[model samples]
Target: HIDLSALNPELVQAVQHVVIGPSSLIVHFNEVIGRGHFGCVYHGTLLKKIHCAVKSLNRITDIGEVSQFLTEGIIMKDFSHPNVLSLLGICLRSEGSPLVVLPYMKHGDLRNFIRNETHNPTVKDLIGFGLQVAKGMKYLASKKFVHRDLAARNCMLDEKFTVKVADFGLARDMYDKEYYSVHNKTGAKLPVKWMALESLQTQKFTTKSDVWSFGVLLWELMTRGAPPYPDVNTFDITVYLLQGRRLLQPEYCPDPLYEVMLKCWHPKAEMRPSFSELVSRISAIFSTF
Candidate 1:
């Protein structure tokens, strides 16, 4: 029988009272496809020959880690959109942290895909990717959810190259470890490069902050997955942003598209466009292609 008592009451309800036995799915423990600060993701297969991604925690050593895992489960359960990933189920094992199942994206993350030298994507193709991510962020904003971690690396691509905004939790820390710096006191890994001016200074997150990161993501797309603020060190990012410094336009980026990205990095968060507005602008630019 699936165990409910082992899970916190809130997590039980957040998972919608549905739980699966660990034996119900076969996770290739030997083959770890991804690793996060909290855990590792393994390729798994269901009994019906369906492939999936299994996010398994290492060990729940602290209350904070458990809460983050549970929060991901809750967010995934509630969100349903084409550009967003859906939670398949929860696997409860008596020994370790709970494992959450998700659809396996064969093509892997957008950053890696863009970084591949052999894969050449045109401006139109890059715009399409940005548009999809904007639509996903629009959906999240409509739900009043702020994706504090919005970056090219956080986006996954399916076989069709469809973008799936994922990693509601710290799973986003899996790749690009070098890009993050651990806060000296809190032991929290912060994505300083992708953070907005207000967020970097005040440590607050909002949809506009997500918009800021989306701009960085767009720049990343244009540059074929180049790192943001290559010249600025992580410690200097806040002051650099404060001085009105922003990412330079990529050589291949269109004037209009670059203008929109600039707006996203506006010093005043209120000056940034909403994801819906971004969708409209990007769509108009994309139609011209």
Candidate 2:
């Protein structure tokens, strides 16, 4: 087991003053929340009262990766929305070591809540979460920011099941075309299954790419957190999707909701419904249910 007490002493000191509540006593050292090519997350708490989550960067050896870390921090600092996870502060205790602090969700991420657990999430709850996600996305789009990485694993939930979009490491500013060019050349590859056709083919990301990702996320939520492809490998799934094999709606997914997802996943980015429209559509459908 890793020694939490010894990890990021500088970060601990920085957050002790910035975070609202009391200082984190033990760091909780809970189980690993999620892992990707870049890093891993750990469910932790501050003083056992103010629950929080901590994300650690994977490789800090290269200058380019260090710049990426700073970029993520800058993006998180600039973004503030209810449905989006708030970046309380950052901890840079040691050179090349970075950690981010965020509010902890008692119910955990939507992926584990729906897939790993036995309880079935109610339709009303699901719709409410979906609306919250759209609200967050709308805010991001309004700011001209694109969440390059959006998936069930990056969506967390509180006790009441309110959805909060997390993981802004891959997020980018749409106005920075030069940054996009650089990112496309050397940044870590994104998950292909969740990427849109344009993003997959040309590495061009926009609000529409996020919308496409949102659609895939909706499908996952509706299907009880079933991954985009539980049976197929990533390579095959990408090939099949690029060849026009659409995702099949699971039996549990409501037809109306499925239709909304289809609209978000339109092959043409221009045709995809805007986040505002998505919120309105989901609100209308939710009221009916």
Report clash pairs, candidate 2: none
TM-score for all models, in order of appearance? 0.93, 0.78
Model 1 lDDT per residue over 91-152, tens place = 76666667778889998989988889888888898999999999999999999988888999
Candidate 2: tens digits of C-alpha lDDT, residues 1-289: 1232553555344434444322442344457865544456677665536666766554444545555455444556667788887776554443435566677788876777777656777777777778889998999899888888777777778877678887674322121121112223225545666788778767789999999999988888888777676665654654676677767887877899999988887878999999999999999988987
Whole-model Cα lDDT per candidate? 0.83, 0.69
Which ranges of candidate 1 are over 4 A from the true structure? Answer: 1-7, 169-173, 183-187
* Cα lDDT for residue 197, candidate 1: 83
Q: Output the lDDT of residue 92, model 2.
A: 48
Q: What is the Cα root-mean-square deviation between model 2 and the actual structure?
A: 7.1
